[PDB]
Amino acid sequence: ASLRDIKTRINATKKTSQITKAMEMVSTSKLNRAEQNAKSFVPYMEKIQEVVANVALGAGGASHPMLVSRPVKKTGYLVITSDRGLAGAYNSNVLRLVYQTIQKRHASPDEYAIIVIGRVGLSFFRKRNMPVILDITRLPDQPSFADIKEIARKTVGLFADGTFDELYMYYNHYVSAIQQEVTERKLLPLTDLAENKQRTVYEFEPSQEEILDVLLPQYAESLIYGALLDAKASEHAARMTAMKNATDNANELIRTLTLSYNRARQAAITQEITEIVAGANAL
Amino acid sequence: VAGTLRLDLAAYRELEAFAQFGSDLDKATQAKLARGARTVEVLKQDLHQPIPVEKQVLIIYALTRGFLDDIPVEDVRRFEKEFYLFLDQNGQHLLEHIRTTKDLPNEDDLNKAIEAFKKTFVVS
Amino acid sequence: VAGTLRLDLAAYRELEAFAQFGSDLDKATQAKLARGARTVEVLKQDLHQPIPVEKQVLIIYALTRGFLDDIPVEDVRRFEKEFYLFLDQNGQHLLEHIRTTKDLPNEDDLNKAIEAFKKTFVVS
Amino acid sequence: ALAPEIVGEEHYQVARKVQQTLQRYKELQDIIAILGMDELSDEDKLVVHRARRIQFFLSQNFHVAEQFTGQPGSYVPVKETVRGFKEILEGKYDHLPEDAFRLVGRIEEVVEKAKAMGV
Amino acid sequence: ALAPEIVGEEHYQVARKVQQTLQRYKELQDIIAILGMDELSDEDKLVVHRARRIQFFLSQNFHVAEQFTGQPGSYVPVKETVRGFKEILEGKYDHLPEDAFRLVGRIEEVVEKAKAMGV
Amino acid sequence: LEVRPDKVTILAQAAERAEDIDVLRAKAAKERAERRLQSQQDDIDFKRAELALKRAMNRLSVAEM
């Protein structure tokens, strides 16, 4: 092609590479902050988990409605997706898994309901006209417990009212900067608890049920919050990796365009000098 | 004095394309951007106003040693213009030493001179 | 009608650059893109089928005044053909007015004729 | 010769639609090369999906080429080609792998190859 | 000729400030077109607010253009232009309507037109 | 509250130090404005970056070569 066209294409590719590199740096900083936020949550989670373990499994206590495996006729689905793109296959993987799971074992819109977090998941479910009942969008890059507590307690109360007998969480689990694993988790009823290594017993100032009925919803909300933090960390890592790959692709394109430019330059010089010499010889 | 200036400008020029996106790494990158912006502001000059080498050396020393890190970017030109007058009024010994020996004066002397000038400068 | 047609087409061309990928656009830009798509559909023409100017001005008037905003994009060509056929039968007076005076007829009559045709027309 | 009054209306429409899809796929090349398939919309993803199949189905096994590959080759009538491309444009074979469309001949051979591949 | 030695210090400063404001306004065209006006920061919207006034005040009514519009036309000395653009940059006329600055000439005519529109 | 003879801990979804329950609800209400502002800024930054990327890609595409 023309030399000027190749030069313009090279300049445009360089601009795109710069933009992608800046986006990657921003994503790296946000990933570091998200990791700090996630690690800030451990002491509360471990303590509430061990308290639930040694209370719910002590002196029986299995009679609580959220502990028994009652027969299921409606199933809940909690899906955590991003509000923004450029994350690669982050949203598509979890959405595809949710769709495949729903189509495999329900085959009826009355058997399930969907709770979705994020714009992309809401749009994906609304395009297929599937029954979304709860949704939250435009979460901050570093969400707190306050802005998720409302929906967490709403879905816990929705289960407690008997609307659906079982629900699952679908989200991306942050393994490393390169690896993010889609995870399916059964939130509740708590069919099993990781019994702690200490195994004590406490006196109950209320009755045991009067303590469990307050403790268990807090445990479910804590689980939801932990899943959300993990999803945010994985989203930031995925965006960082995608931007790095885009920058590498742009660099390779520039590398090939440079060779094309050199060939065009040599050809142009040869043509010009040949024309000049021919014009000189014509006299 | 030129060694630090060269490195500062080189570091700033590569990071300039990423400045419009705000916080990237506030520990180091933000300092680099501010230092580079002040360096760019210092090197600007007007027509038909050559500067003696000693004043250039002193202003570059002030820039590189961090005395301008608190001055806002928009006031660097006026800071330099007033600093030249301050040096004319009170810094004659430093200028004479630089002219005679072609070397920097005693560090504490010009540090104190710059601090005294900064005591009088008012930020707009 | 040419100025409005040109402005709509230019706006569509400008806005189309930001709809290739990524996040979606807001509703006003969606309406502008739909209008531009209908404008592009209108300008298509078959081989060896010249159109009299008095029908071109009428179809462009119908497009620019928003009468095609509810017609699906895939039906615009058939709408134009059936509109020409309708004008051949019931729009003769205003066709003659355009031919003789070289000027656009009353807005009231054009609106009545277009609404009558839209009442007659059936979408796919 | 590609005119409605020479080859028929259906042939002309199918050819024009195929060319339109291929043109759109060519336009999306820079975005696909840099940012990948993830950033495309649903409409563009389907366009790429069908364009890959259309591009692979245009390939054919020749009788002369049997000396190179050992495959006997095939002769395809025009109506069969038109019907196959019309079916592909309608999404009837969106579930088949794209490798089953290479050097295949008729459209039924695509299904046979896909079945032999384990689909 | 745009140098302080030729046109003076005040003229040079006013011209440089106008150029900087107009250049800043140009960088926000895509953001305003796509994201919208309400997303801008306070300083950015002040910049565009003054940039619209500056851009409209650069228009003028010409003597030979009278037959187009019927306005007599005006001849503006260079002294008046600098004063008017300095006054606009200071925010002295931020309260006037945007259309008062179109095709007027001297800065007093902006106030006259705004009064004629009933400001 | 969970108590141990050598360890005492209480788990709270929200906590403050003024002991005025009106101050707690005041802080909870005031945090809402900060949350909305942070979410809006996070959205707008990404939108601006995406616009820059879109313009660059459009220029690259129109430079088809």
Short mmCIF file of N, CA, C and O in Angstrom, two decimals, chain A residues 9 16 85-89 127 246 249, chain D residues 30 33-36 38-39 42-43 45:
data_model
loop_
_atom_site.label_atom_id
_atom_site.label_comp_id
_atom_site.label_asym_id
_atom_site.label_seq_id
_atom_site.Cartn_x
_atom_site.Cartn_y
_atom_site.Cartn_z
N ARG A 9 -1.30 4.01 9.97
CA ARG A 9 -1.70 2.80 10.69
C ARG A 9 -0.76 2.51 11.85
O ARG A 9 -1.21 2.12 12.94
N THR A 16 -3.19 3.05 20.37
CA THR A 16 -3.97 2.01 21.03
C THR A 16 -3.14 1.26 22.07
O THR A 16 -3.64 0.94 23.16
N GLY A 85 -17.25 -3.86 31.06
CA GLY A 85 -16.63 -4.81 30.16
C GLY A 85 -15.12 -4.78 30.20
O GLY A 85 -14.51 -4.43 31.21
N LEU A 86 -14.51 -5.17 29.08
CA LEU A 86 -13.07 -5.26 28.90
C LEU A 86 -12.41 -6.24 29.86
O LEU A 86 -11.20 -6.14 30.10
N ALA A 87 -13.16 -7.19 30.40
CA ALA A 87 -12.63 -8.18 31.33
C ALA A 87 -12.35 -9.52 30.66
O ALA A 87 -12.02 -10.48 31.36
N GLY A 88 -12.47 -9.60 29.34
CA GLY A 88 -12.27 -10.88 28.68
C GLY A 88 -13.47 -11.78 28.84
O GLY A 88 -14.63 -11.34 28.74
N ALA A 89 -13.21 -13.06 29.09
CA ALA A 89 -14.27 -14.04 29.27
C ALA A 89 -14.76 -14.14 30.70
O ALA A 89 -15.29 -15.19 31.08
N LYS A 127 -32.54 -10.56 28.07
CA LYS A 127 -32.63 -10.89 26.65
C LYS A 127 -33.32 -12.23 26.44
O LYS A 127 -34.10 -12.39 25.49
N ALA A 246 -3.83 -7.43 25.02
CA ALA A 246 -4.10 -6.47 23.95
C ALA A 246 -2.86 -5.66 23.61
O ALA A 246 -2.58 -5.41 22.43
N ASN A 249 -0.55 -7.82 21.52
CA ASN A 249 -1.04 -7.95 20.15
C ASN A 249 -0.74 -6.69 19.34
O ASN A 249 -0.32 -6.76 18.18
N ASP D 30 -9.93 -5.98 12.51
CA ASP D 30 -9.01 -5.28 13.40
C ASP D 30 -9.43 -5.44 14.86
O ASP D 30 -8.58 -5.68 15.74
N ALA D 33 -8.61 -8.92 15.95
CA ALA D 33 -7.18 -9.13 16.08
C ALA D 33 -6.62 -8.50 17.35
O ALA D 33 -5.73 -9.07 17.98
N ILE D 34 -7.11 -7.32 17.74
CA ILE D 34 -6.54 -6.65 18.91
C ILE D 34 -7.27 -7.05 20.18
O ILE D 34 -6.66 -7.61 21.10
N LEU D 35 -8.57 -6.78 20.26
CA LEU D 35 -9.31 -6.97 21.50
C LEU D 35 -9.96 -8.34 21.63
O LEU D 35 -10.51 -8.65 22.69
N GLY D 36 -9.92 -9.17 20.59
CA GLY D 36 -10.51 -10.48 20.69
C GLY D 36 -12.01 -10.47 20.45
O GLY D 36 -12.63 -9.46 20.13
N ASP D 38 -14.27 -11.14 22.67
CA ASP D 38 -15.04 -10.92 23.89
C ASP D 38 -15.81 -9.60 23.86
O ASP D 38 -16.89 -9.51 24.45
N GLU D 39 -15.27 -8.58 23.20
CA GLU D 39 -15.88 -7.26 23.22
C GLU D 39 -16.96 -7.07 22.17
O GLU D 39 -17.63 -6.03 22.17
N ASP D 42 -23.71 -9.21 20.52
CA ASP D 42 -24.33 -10.49 20.18
C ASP D 42 -24.53 -10.62 18.67
O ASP D 42 -24.33 -11.71 18.11
N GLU D 43 -24.93 -9.54 18.01
CA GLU D 43 -25.14 -9.59 16.56
C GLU D 43 -23.83 -9.86 15.83
O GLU D 43 -23.78 -10.65 14.88
N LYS D 45 -21.13 -11.34 17.04
CA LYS D 45 -20.67 -12.69 17.33
C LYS D 45 -21.33 -13.71 16.41
O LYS D 45 -20.67 -14.61 15.89
#
